[PDB]
Amino acid sequence: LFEEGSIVNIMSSIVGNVFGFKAVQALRLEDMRIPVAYLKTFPGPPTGIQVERDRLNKYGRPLLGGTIKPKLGLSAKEYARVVYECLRGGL
Amino acid sequence: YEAGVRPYRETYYDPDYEPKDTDLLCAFRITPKPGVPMEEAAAAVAAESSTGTWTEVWSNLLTDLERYKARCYRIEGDVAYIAYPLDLFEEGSIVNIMSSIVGNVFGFKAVQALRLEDMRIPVAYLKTFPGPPTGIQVERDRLNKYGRPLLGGTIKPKLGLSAKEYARVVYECLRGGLDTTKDDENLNSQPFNRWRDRFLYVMEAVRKAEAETGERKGHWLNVTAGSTEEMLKRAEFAAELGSRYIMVDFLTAGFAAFASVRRRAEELGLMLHCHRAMHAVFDRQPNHGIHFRVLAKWLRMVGGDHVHTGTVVGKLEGDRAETLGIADLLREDYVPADPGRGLFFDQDWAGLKPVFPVASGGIHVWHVPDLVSIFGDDAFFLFGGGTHGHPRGSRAGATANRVAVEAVVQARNEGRDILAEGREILEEAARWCPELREAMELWG
Amino acid sequence: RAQYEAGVRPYRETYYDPDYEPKDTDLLCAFRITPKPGVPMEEAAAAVAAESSTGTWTEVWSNLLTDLERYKARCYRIEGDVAYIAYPLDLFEEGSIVNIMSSIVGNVFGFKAVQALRLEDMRIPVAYLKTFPGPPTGIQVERDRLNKYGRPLLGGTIKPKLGLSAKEYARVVYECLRGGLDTTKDDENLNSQPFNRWRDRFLYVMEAVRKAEAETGERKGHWLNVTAGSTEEMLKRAEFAAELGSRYIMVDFLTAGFAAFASVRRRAEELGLMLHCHRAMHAVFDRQPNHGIHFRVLAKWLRMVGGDHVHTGTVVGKLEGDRAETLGIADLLREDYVPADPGRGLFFDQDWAGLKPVFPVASGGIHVWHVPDLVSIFGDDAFFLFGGGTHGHPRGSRAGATANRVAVEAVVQARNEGRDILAEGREILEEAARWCPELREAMELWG
Ligand SMILES: O=C(O)[C@@](O)(COP(=O)(O)O)[C@H](O)[C@H](O)COP(=O)(O)O
Numbered sequence: 001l002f003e004e005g006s007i008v009n010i011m012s013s014i015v016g017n018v019f020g021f022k023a024v025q026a027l028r029l030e031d032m033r034i035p036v037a038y039l040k041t042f043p044g045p046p047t048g049i050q051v052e053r054d055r056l057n058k059y060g061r062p063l064l065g066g067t068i069k070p071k072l073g074l075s076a077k078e079y080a081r082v083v084y085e086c087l088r089g090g091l
Numbered sequence: 092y093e094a095g096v097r098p099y100r101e102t103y104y105d106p107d108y109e110p111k112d113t114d115l116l117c118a119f120r121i122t123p124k125p126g127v128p129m130e131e132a133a134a135a136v137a138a139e140s141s142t143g144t145w146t147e148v149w150s151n152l153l154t155d156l157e158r159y160k161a162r163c164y165r166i167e168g169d170v171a172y173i174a175y176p177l178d179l180f181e182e183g184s185i186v187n188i189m190s191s192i193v194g195n196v197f198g199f200k201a202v203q204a205l206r207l208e209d210m211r212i213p214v215a216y217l218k219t220f221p222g223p224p225t226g227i228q229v230e231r232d233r234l235n236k237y238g239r240p241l242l243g244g245t246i247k248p249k250l251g252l253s254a255k256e257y258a259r260v261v262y263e264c265l266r267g268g269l270d271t272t273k274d275d276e277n278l279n280s281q282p283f284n285r286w287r288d289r290f291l292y293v294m295e296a297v298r299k300a301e302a303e304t305g306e307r308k309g310h311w312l313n314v315t316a317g318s319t320e321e322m323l324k325r326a327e328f329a330a331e332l333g334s335r336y337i338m339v340d341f342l343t344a345g346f347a348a349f350a351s352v353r354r355r356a357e358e359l360g361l362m363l364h365c366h367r368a369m370h371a372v373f374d375r376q377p378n379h380g381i382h383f384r385v386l387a388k389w390l391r392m393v394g395g396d397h398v399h400t401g402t403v404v405g406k407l408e409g410d411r412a413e414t415l416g417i418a419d420l421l422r423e424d425y426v427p428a429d430p431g432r433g434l435f436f437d438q439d440w441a442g443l444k445p446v447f448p449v450a451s452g453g454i455h456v457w458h459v460p461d462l463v464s465i466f467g468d469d470a471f472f473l474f475g476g477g478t479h480g481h482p483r484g485s486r487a488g489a490t491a492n493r494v495a496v497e498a499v500v501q502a503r504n505e506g507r508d509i510l511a512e513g514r515e516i517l518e519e520a521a522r523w524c525p526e527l528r529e530a531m532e533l534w535g
Numbered sequence: 536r537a538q539y540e541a542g543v544r545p546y547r548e549t550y551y552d553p554d555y556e557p558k559d560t561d562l563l564c565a566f567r568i569t570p571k572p573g574v575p576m577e578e579a580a581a582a583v584a585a586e587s588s589t590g591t592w593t594e595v596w597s598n599l600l601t602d603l604e605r606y607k608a609r610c611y612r613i614e615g616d617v618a619y620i621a622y623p624l625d626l627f628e629e630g631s632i633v634n635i636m637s638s639i640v641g642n643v644f645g646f647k648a649v650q651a652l653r654l655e656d657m658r659i660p661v662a663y664l665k666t667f668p669g670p671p672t673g674i675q676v677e678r679d680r681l682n683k684y685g686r687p688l689l690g691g692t693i694k695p696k697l698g699l700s701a702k703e704y705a706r707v708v709y710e711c712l713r714g715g716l717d718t719t720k721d722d723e724n725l726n727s728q729p730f731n732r733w734r735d736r737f738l739y740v741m742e743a744v745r746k747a748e749a750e751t752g753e754r755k756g757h758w759l760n761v762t763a764g765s766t767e768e769m770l771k772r773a774e775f776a777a778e779l780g781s782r783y784i785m786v787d788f789l790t791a792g793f794a795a796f797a798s799v800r801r802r803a804e805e806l807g808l809m810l811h812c813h814r815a816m817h818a819v820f821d822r823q824p825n826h827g828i829h830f831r832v833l834a835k836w837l838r839m840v841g842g843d844h845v846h847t848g849t850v851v852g853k854l855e856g857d858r859a860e861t862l863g864i865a866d867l868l869r870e871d872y873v874p875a876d877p878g879r880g881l882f883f884d885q886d887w888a889g890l891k892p893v894f895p896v897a898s899g900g901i902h903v904w905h906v907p908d909l910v911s912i913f914g915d916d917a918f919f920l921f922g923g924g925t926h927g928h929p930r931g932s933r934a935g936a937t938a939n940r941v942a943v944e945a946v947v948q949a950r951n952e953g954r955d956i957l958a959e960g961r962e963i964l965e966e967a968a969r970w971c972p973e974l975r976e977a978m979e980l981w982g
Pocket residue numbers: 245247275276367368399400401402407450451452453454473474475476477591592642
């Protein structure tokens with residue numbers, strides 16, 4: 001029933017129309033079992049956990065991140081100087 | 092880490108292993124070196140095709156080798172079954188299959204002979220392949236011919252005919268009653284018959300014959316060449332001329348180039364006919380090589396609308412039972428295993444559309460009762476030399492072949508037995524067909 | 536309206552010409568025939584020549600629209616059991632191996648008239664051979680690129696064949712390269728799998744190749760396998776290997792098909808990439824001496840279409856190989872004119888019309904003890920590959936590479952002194968290991 005290698009179809013068939021019926025006042029898709037046959041038609045992540053960690057040369061600890069704030073308003077010049085402070089300081 | 096030579100059968104022989112539904116199971120017929128045990132040779136094939144080498148290496152410990160190794164789980168005295176983990180294979184590439192299973196293990200010294208009799212493609216792996224571009228059901232609508240085998244014919248002589256004279260034989264056959272004709276397997280772009288002139292001429296002959304008979308005729312133009320960048324150039328020209336069909340030798344042109352042509356052939360809206368040239372270097376000796384049913388599976392996986400399966404009664408060797416099993420592998424959607432018909436494994440085809448089996452060879456009117464019985468109505472019959480060898484030309488020959496098939500098919504729909512009353516049926520047909528009478532007199 | 540004499544005629548009538556003389560532009564094919572009980576040797580030979588040419592099982596009416604004698608092949612000799620057949624030059628397309636392998640071997644191998652049939656050899660005429668490009672780089676240009684003269688170049692296959700991730704694959708590659716090996720290569724099974732995808736393997740191994748060049752000071756390479764399921768994919772992997780700075784790509788030409796191989800070879804020339812060719816799935820052809828195509832024919836077809844490397848097979852390894860016939864293939868790949876020699880299996884003189892030579896690659900189940908015998912067979916212009924003989928060393932891969940390099944250096948240097956090789960290879964190795972600890976552990980384990 002599903003086109004190979006297309007999430008758009010699996011979410012067009014299952015959660016497309018059934019949620020809006022009068023006969024059901026509420027409907028939640030709790031989980032889903034993707035078969036192995038349908039799983040080999042998808043590429044998966046480009047890099048993954050191991051390739052990313054090697055590409056950064058960081059091991060044995062969680063990787064620190066951060067989001068630049070305020071999330072709107074800063075000009076590109078002032079936006080970059082905040083980025084420099086975070087990365088230089090330890091993120 | 093321990094180093095040194097160890098026997099294969101202590102790592103790759105697992106008689107208690109149970110095959111999964113995501114394993115490529117292969118059945119090998121093995122002739123070990125005198126002295127080498129039967130199970131020892133079986134393990135050498137399993138190791139040296141998946142993850143093995145003649146000595147233990149320090150780099151085995153870097154992987155969970157039990158997760159990837161192939162292992163022989165069953166031996167029937169002479170046939171060793173080997174199971175291949177799913178992760179060993181690249182998605183949507185027959186070439187990787189034929190580089191792993193049949194890539195390196197045939198040249199060993201421990202095995203005096205090795206034949207890949209049959210193989211099992213799991214559904215998980217089979218969903219990564221496109222399958223035939225059109226299939227049997229779509230093509231019959233595209234040609235508007237139902238309820239009978241579709242009649243074709245190879246244009247003879249094999250080489251020599253100039254572009255104008257070649258297009259005259261094509262028009263004679265199609266006007267006579269053949270549904271399609273085809274370029275020969277070795278007729279690509281020779282100096283006497285260049286392709287751009289052959290393509291232009293025979294397509295005028297196809298349209299002219301199609302405009303007179305009122306039916307839908309076609310010609311299988313041979314686009315095989317020395318490179319993919321040239322086959323694609325020839326395939327585009329055939330589509331721009333209005334032809335429905337093209338033709339590729341999918342074994343002499345290889346599988347990567349064939350898969351590249353198939354992708355374009357679908358984009359251009361062309362049926363793709365696959366000639367199996369060189370197949371007999373592989374599937375001839377019953378003790379070494381690769382059985383055709385393995386190559387027949389690979390064709391449907393990568394996608395071919397037609398395939399030569401080989402007539403049982405022609406001039407080319409083929410087995411009555413084995414051809415029946417291959418015909419099922421190309422048409423049905425699930426083929427249960429059958430030891431009599433040569434099959435070793437169940438093959439679920441996962442919704443891949445069927446393939447026309449093409450029966451070609453040294454077949455004439457007399458072989459029609461045998462061809463219709465073996466193949467049914469979902470097949471092509473090719474009368475290359477049985478059409479042009481008629482004592483009165485090709486248009487007369489194409490009529491005799493056409494009348495013989497319809498007489499046998501209609502008399503089969505009448506409930507009459509074919510394998511016993513073929514001679515009588517053909518004689519009653521010849522009583523009113525003059526062309527068939529000459530063809531039956533000349534041959535046999 | 537002539538009503539040609541119809542019917543079925545014996546092939547011997549119009550396709551066997553014992554008085555024919557082959558022109559210097561015809562293609563000569565030598566077949567080893569095993570005809571039916573009852574079918575004569577002359578008829579089976581004529582049947583082979585007819586169905587690889589204008590012939591057909593019956594007399595067609597269109598035989599009178601052509602001058603058949605211009606185009607028809609004919610068996611001009613039967614030497615007891617071998618039938619020589621001559622094909623006119625006009626029968627074939629210019630610069631396409633596919634057409635000749637669709638005519639000579641396309642259809643004749645599965646006839647009910649012949650129980651078995653082997654294409655022993657052929658003679659590609661200079662007129663036909665001039666239409667082919669040949670190898671992109673060759674032997675002499677390659678040696679300049681690697682800057683390694685006067686010895687057989689050393690390589691190896693990373694093992695195990697499948698299972699290693701790209702992080703651990705490059706770790707093994709670096710260990711072999713750092714230890715002396717001039718080259719390594721992706722195994723033929725390793726195209727692009729979930730455990731080792733191609734875009735991650737290409738990046739990781741070439742970081743090791745670049746790294747190994749820094750410490751050693753020599754120039755190393757890795758034969759990246761670009762084989763894929765389609766020509767466009769095989770090419771797409773070729774530019775990625777090209778832009779990473781790789782000197783090398785690798786193709787399974789027999790499995791990928793000669794058309795896709797010729798498409799890759801054109802690109803490999805445009806990107807300045809040497810092109811190692813792996814002969815995987817060859818023994819399906821050239822194993823049984825009664826049916827198939829001998830490998831010397833596929834070695835000819837390779838040099839025509841063009842490949843810098845090819846496996847010819849060690850005589851003493853785990854894979855099959857004949858001492859005399861392997862020498863013939865080495866000459867048939869490296870030389871420029873090969874006189875016919877019945878001892879070496881060569882039937883026709885082959886002039887190569889200025890096509891540049893090819894490295895014969897000797898790979899299989901070989902180790903240090905096989906070095907003296909390999910040097911005797913192949914000489915200097917060859918590649919020696921130790922895949923299980925390098926990583927199978929008791930003390931790792933870098934130690935295994937050192938022992939293999941020391942063995943070849945000692946044997947070649949002893950050959951250059953006039954000392955015999957075959958008789959005292961064991962000696963040469965013993966007083967070469969007397970100063971190298973790794974070579975002692977190499978010969979201690981094997982033998
Ligand atoms: O070359 C030939 O003989 C044909 O043109 C038939 O001509 P006739 O009809 O005159 O025999 C066919 O291509 C081969 O028979 C293919 O056989 P397969 O399908 O086994 O490859």
